[PDB]
């Protein structure tokens, strides 16, 4: 679904390398709404290597 997917490589460019590989990641976020525990599952799409995307996912879920 287009609603769940969160793209990650998106730029003006305002240059990044090409490659052979772009990897779909899943995520699942424990949170609380209405003082009741509930989850949230989103998807991620980037070929940046695992060391960047964990830093890129934290900026998405900052709030």
């Amino acid at each position: 679904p287009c609603d769940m997917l969160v793209d990650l490589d998106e730029s003006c460019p305002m240059r990044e390398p090409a490659g052979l590989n772009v990897t779909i990641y899943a995520s699942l976020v424990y949170l609380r709404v209405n003082q009741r525990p509930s989850m949230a599952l989103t998807f991620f799409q980037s070929g940046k290597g695992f060391a960047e995307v964990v830093a890129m996912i934290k900026d998405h879920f900052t709030d």
């Binding site: 990044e16 390398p17 090409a18 490659g19 290597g49 695992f50 960047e52 830093a55």
Partner: protein, 294 residues
Amino acid sequence: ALDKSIVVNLTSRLFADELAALQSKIGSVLPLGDCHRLQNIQALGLGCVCSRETSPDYIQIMQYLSKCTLAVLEEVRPDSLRLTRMDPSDNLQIKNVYAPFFQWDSNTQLAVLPPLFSRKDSTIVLESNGFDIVFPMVVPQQLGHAILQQLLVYHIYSKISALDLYTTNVSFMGRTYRLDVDNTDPRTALRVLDDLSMYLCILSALVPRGCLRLLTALVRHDRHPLTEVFEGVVPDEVTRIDLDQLSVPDDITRMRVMFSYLQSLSSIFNLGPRLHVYAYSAETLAASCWYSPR
């Protein structure tokens, strides 16, 4: 099956000077941008992120390195550079000409790092075309880790200065080395340190009490070879936390979360792509290895 070869077109005849350096490093790993046979020379360098006039930031360069496809040279003709390619998951001959020389053997382990000892030795300049080429360095994981350990320790203790023997020296069995820091942009090296301040103060909240009381029984008299960090004196902080009573099912829930956040420190201490050598020849300096991008 599959083909992998990259022949690099080039707009000027190279001189005999720079042809001698490229002939000396004939087996060498260097990244490049696009996955095609024909290619400009301005993609072959690592110098698109590490330039002379711009201050390089070695974390961002290393952050750049896990994106790119990698390549090994085959020939250096006077016009065109001819390279072969590294793809998952393929066995390939790799031959180290890397100048801060280390010794490998059969069943060793490798990883690719930016040049962190001598930039002038590891980058040759092409005055013929005006664009310079930067070679990366391949290091076994033990020194592959221990350089990134010392580089993160440096950017903590350069900010406190707002001297060198403790901050810029990588230690190893038998040798000591000098990291190359004259002009580094610390800001991409500090978002890594900003996330370390996130994990490390969570790890200070869920410390097990039985493991702190174990050290108060240990380091006072029981002296071991690997506990010489504390020098025989307990810290002032460890005596302040163990005032509670020990209970087993409290620390069961703590040691699971202690276990699960040490899974997360893989993401902040990542090297680049890793190279699993299964056979290495000694006198020929070649090897055989399968490439795995992680």
